[PDB]
């Protein structure tokens, strides 16, 4: 039921160096908050198709976490910042906009439970995006999985892909330890059965309660940065 293969992640590590392209596009950053207790918070940032930061936020309350993550976004030169507003982060818009006062950084609340972005458009690569994906959580995790698979095929099988459709992890920038923590979370993201034939993923709560998997906040942060708001 897992949606991302470890081999794709290994291939995608420094794929831009392996294939000879560099980061181009906006800088997109995202934060997965957590209450105040056991589970580390998450942050991810990319410059175009190259991931440059994966960070864990430890021993922080919800507001300290948002300060931490928005400060990283500023440090990373983000053009866009997203955060999870489905849970305890639902109240963070004021603090987030305050943090970005006077800076050209957009702030977007991501709610994975919502119907997919652009759900009436045809599905690519009569069937629409909304027929395929239950919600944004599924849509953007599959955006991630699709980028990774294409990168694997390019790096390992020599099949051309546009760098804009791939994803590379900058290992030197991110750091080996944090990259490994991310990969260990990503390989646990899984599909669940859906009675309307749509792609749907387990939520963080379900993963913990059913499989004893700690909240994958690094993975979810990276997933959210797949959406570049319009």
Automatic annotation (TrEMBL):
Ca(2+) binds at residues 32, 84, 220. Mn(2+) 3 binds at residues 32, 217, 220. Transmembrane segments: none annotated. Mg(2+) 2 binds at residues 32, 35, 84. Mn(2+) 2 binds at residues 32, 217. It comes from the Viruses. Mg(2+) 3 binds at residues 32, 35, 220. Mn(2+) 1 binds at residues 32, 84. This is Gene 2 protein. The gene is 2. The chain holds residues 213 to 454 of 470 of the full protein.
